[PDB]
Amino acid sequence: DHPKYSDMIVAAIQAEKNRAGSSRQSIQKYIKSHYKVGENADSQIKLSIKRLVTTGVLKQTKGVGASGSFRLAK
Amino acid sequence: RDNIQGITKPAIRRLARRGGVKRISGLIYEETRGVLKVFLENVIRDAVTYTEHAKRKTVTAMDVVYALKRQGRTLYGFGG
Amino acid sequence: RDNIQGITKPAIRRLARRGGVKRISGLIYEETRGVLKVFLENVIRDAVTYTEHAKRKTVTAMDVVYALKRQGRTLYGFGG
Amino acid sequence: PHRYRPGTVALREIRRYQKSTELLIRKLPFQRLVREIAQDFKTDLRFQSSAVMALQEACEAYLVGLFEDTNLCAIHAKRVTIMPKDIQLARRIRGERA
Amino acid sequence: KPHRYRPGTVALREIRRYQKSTELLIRKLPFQRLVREIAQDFKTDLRFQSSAVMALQEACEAYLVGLFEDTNLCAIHAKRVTIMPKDIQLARRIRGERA
DNA sequence: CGCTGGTTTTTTTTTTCATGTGCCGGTCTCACACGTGCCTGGAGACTAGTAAGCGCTTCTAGTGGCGGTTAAAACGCGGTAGACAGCG
DNA sequence: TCTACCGCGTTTTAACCGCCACTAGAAGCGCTTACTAGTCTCCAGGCACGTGTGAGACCGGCACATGAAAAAAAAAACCAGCGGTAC
Ligand SMILES: [Ca+2]
Ligand SMILES: [Ca+2]
Ligand SMILES: [Ca+2]
Ligand SMILES: [Ca+2]
Ligand SMILES: [Ca+2]
Ligand SMILES: [Ca+2]
Ligand SMILES: [Ca+2]
Ligand SMILES: [Ca+2]
Ligand SMILES: [Ca+2]
Ligand SMILES: [Ca+2]
Ligand SMILES: [Ca+2]
Ligand SMILES: [Ca+2]
Ligand SMILES: [Ca+2]
Ligand SMILES: [Ca+2]
């Protein structure tokens, strides 16, 4: 139903509290709860995070790859 | 409450501590009781069998000692 | 000397396969040789001891069978 | 409000009980358990007090040993906490089980 | 375009194969050399019944196959699929084969 | 704009390929099977010597139950460290 | 990330103990006699040595399991283009 897994992440990380970062499994849980979602959503949010990490728009504060904590444009 | 419950959590904890265990899952205490029971069943069964063969109604230390040797768990300091 | 190397990687691999092993670290082949050697040392030592006691110069199957029984590794089909 | 970190007392306990040799199961509850199990094989059986003590020594010994082996199985799985599957492995490898 | 089996698929095939069979899996001569060599250390100019050497081999292969079973379990118990020396060592320690 | 529809991508599926394993019908070889004659070990019957069963005695131990202490268990509390699961 | 294990403090439990009294039953003595050994004989059933026959072990081949890589279909993640809105 709900689009822009990009807009989905941004809306879940907005809602998520001012942190050093925001970790996938805490965002994956928010998006699955708040919007009409599928199963492969867990595996699409994983591809959604990596394209936002890629575009400089999101950046990761701790960890590496797509297990760790991610921050926005400052 | 079967006498098996008389083998208290804290008692098992103690045995494990002598075994050099630091942290113990909750499930272990029942699991241990189960094992301990099988052990005693097997040992006593044999012990009693020795008793019956000696046409006695009193289980002797030796009856146990002989039983433990059979089970390959030789015990020093109770005779034999 | 050092026929221990005659126990080839592929032979060990075979034994492990019968043991239901799927993947095997490289280090295992030397480790296995070490173990296999200790096993044989212990068994043969006893076997030869039986041979010497029988004032023989030829190790018999029975010499081995008796040795394996001693070691608790009873073997059927060589005159047990 | 003095509090010891989780594990610090555990260690203390270990050192203490390894140091000592006294039986760690309460004598009566054990003795009841023995007689109870014995009944299943033959009724109205008497026990030398020494025979019951022998059984306890053998039992505690056995378990202490089993825990050592269990502990190793836990660590071998990069755990510090023993679990039923640790015991089961130990008993399987010992040829006690299956 | 060549044909390749994924790592492990042949391993499985091998397992099924060798479990099915009973034939000795060590080459008979190299073993027999190893036996005589070890025997020397206990007594020199020793002869062996051929049956005695075969008994030893049966017992050895049996022993190892068994040890591997136990080792395999120790590997899996550590959430691994690959046996390693520490798997064997544990198995032997628990068996009371070594301290 | 918010929609919405169709299409781009990610999943699952079907498929095709290939390969290897299992099976039958026909074939050779050798270990099974049996059969001989001979030997040894079994059974036999007898005699005597002994071990053990049975009853009697003794004596011991082990059992049951006494007061009440004080230690241990047991409960629930609250807070971390570790189980654990995923990623790369 | 999540909780289930530890380590803490109060409420409940019961084991321990140092003692006694009473008995079942362990243990030990003397009798009997029933059993087992240990002898001389007789004998056949089981051993080795040696025969020949059928089973299984082998072969090839063709049919069946399988796993792998490839073609096809489905499910779901998105661009436009649009109508509709107020400019
Ligand atoms: Ca001579
Ligand atoms: Ca019963
Ligand atoms: Ca009962
Ligand atoms: Ca009675
Ligand atoms: Ca009674
Ligand atoms: Ca056929
Ligand atoms: Ca053949
Ligand atoms: Ca958890
Ligand atoms: Ca809690
Ligand atoms: Ca006849
Ligand atoms: Ca005949
Ligand atoms: Ca024959
Ligand atoms: Ca035939
Ligand atoms: Ca748009």
Side-chain angles (χ1 to χ4, degrees), chain A residues 24 44 46 50-51 66-67:
Chain A
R24 158 225 37 181
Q44 295 285 15
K46 183 210 212 66
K50 274 298 170 32
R51 275 146 185 173
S67 187

Side-chain angles (χ1 to χ4, degrees), chain B residues 50-62:
Chain B
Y50 281 115
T51 312
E52 286 174 335
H53 185 86
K55 285 138 107 210
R56 283 191 277 89
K57 280 182 52 213
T58 309
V59 180
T60 66
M62 284 317 299

Side-chain angles (χ1 to χ4, degrees), chain E residues 7-73:
Chain E
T9 300
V10 180
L12 280 188
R13 287 215 324 254
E14 280 176 60
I15 294 175
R16 312 182 180 282
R17 179 182 155 179
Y18 288 121
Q19 293 195 334
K20 198 152 293 175
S21 63
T22 67
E23 87 278 42
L24 294 174
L25 305 178
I26 300 167
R27 277 124 14 101
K28 308 215 175 169
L29 258 61
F31 184 76
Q32 178 178 151
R33 315 222 279 267
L34 178 59
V35 161
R36 295 174 186 290
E37 160 191 332
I38 287 162
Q40 72 197 2
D41 295 349
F42 300 114
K43 182 176 166 177
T44 61
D45 278 20
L46 267 181
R47 282 154 188 269
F48 282 92
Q49 295 188 324
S50 62
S51 48
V53 169
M54 282 330 273
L56 275 167
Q57 202 175 339
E58 286 288 353
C60 266
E61 296 202 19
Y63 167 72
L64 289 172
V65 167
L67 182 62
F68 277 127
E69 271 166 54
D70 283 4
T71 304
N72 204 40
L73 288 176

Side-chain angles (χ1 to χ4, degrees), chain C:
Chain C
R1 309 187 75 184
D2 266 82
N3 295 268
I4 197 61
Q5 285 326 299
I7 314 307
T8 52
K9 169 179 173 183
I12 294 163
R13 270 180 64 270
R14 283 197 294 285
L15 290 160
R17 290 285 182 258
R18 191 169 278 168
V21 170
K22 182 179 182 197
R23 210 160 178 277
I24 303 165
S25 166
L27 294 173
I28 280 192
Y29 305 104
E30 260 309 302
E31 187 77 4
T32 307
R33 287 188 188 99
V35 165
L36 172 59
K37 210 200 169 218
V38 172
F39 183 91
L40 278 163
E41 286 165 341
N42 285 280
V43 176
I44 293 169
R45 176 187 303 123
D46 284 9
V48 167
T49 303
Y50 281 113
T51 312
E52 287 173 340
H53 184 84
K55 285 146 151 174
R56 283 192 277 88
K57 296 203 180 197
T58 309
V59 179
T60 67
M62 285 315 298
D63 291 341
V64 172
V65 169
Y66 291 144
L68 288 165
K69 197 152 193 177
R70 268 213 74 261
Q71 305 282 341
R73 305 224 88 255
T74 306
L75 178 64
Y76 285 6
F78 288 88

Side-chain angles (χ1 to χ4, degrees), chain A:
Chain A
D1 189 285
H2 274 132
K4 290 303 164 200
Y5 274 49
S6 300
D7 200 314
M8 264 339 165
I9 304 277
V10 137
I13 75 181
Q14 161 235 124
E16 198 151 346
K17 34 185 142 199
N18 283 336
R19 280 213 220 149
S22 174
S23 202
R24 158 225 37 181
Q25 45 217 63
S26 62
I27 95 178
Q28 273 180 348
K29 182 166 316 198
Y30 180 103
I31 330 184
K32 283 204 296 270
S33 47
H34 279 59
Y35 310 96
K36 344 294 163 164
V37 83
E39 43 226 271
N40 73 136
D42 246 32
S43 267
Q44 295 285 15
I45 285 157
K46 183 210 212 66
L47 309 181
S48 175
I49 285 164
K50 274 298 170 32
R51 275 146 185 173
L52 282 172
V53 158
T54 292
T55 27
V57 55
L58 283 298
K59 84 95 97 319
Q60 54 179 117
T61 73
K62 224 208 183 262
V64 72
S67 187
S69 48
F70 313 78
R71 176 170 75 67
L72 301 275
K74 193 170 181 296

